[PDB]
A = this chain, B = another copy of it.
Amino acid sequence: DIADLRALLEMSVVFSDPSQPDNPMIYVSDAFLVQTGYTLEEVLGRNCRFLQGPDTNPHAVEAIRQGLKAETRFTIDILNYRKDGSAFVNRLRIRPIYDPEGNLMFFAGAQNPVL
């Protein structure tokens, strides 16, 4: 049986597991894959920083890293790239998800291109 992770949420959605090394994605929606130009096999198990590219702001990247450590709700606009190298401004919304014990379980991310 496969865990229905979407039962924890028409949008680009990602779930990551901070208990695993490098905080890898464990679920991505089809909308995410279509927008970024990747297949499921290319994404699952990797950190979502593969969306970052040559002109991505390094301070924006560090802001996200600290926001994760803070375990709080945050949103940020960051330059991301598709597999074909085309760039888009990504409005990234991230929030922590806890287990009934109160321990950090997943991060949930909802993305959408800013236009």
Contacts and interface: CB of A to CB of B under 8 A. Distances in A.
- How many copies make up the complex? 2
A8 B40 CA distance: 22
Interface stretch (A47-55, A58-66, A82-90, A99-107): A99-107
A48 to B, nearest CB: 14
Interface residues of A, number: 24
Contacts of A10: none
Contacts of A98: 1-3
A42 interface: no
Contact of A105 (B3, B40, B95, B97): B3
A105 B106 CA distance: 12
Contact of A44 (B96, B101, B105): B101
Interface of A: 1-5, 7-8, 17, 19-20, 26-27, 40, 44-45, 95-101, 105-106
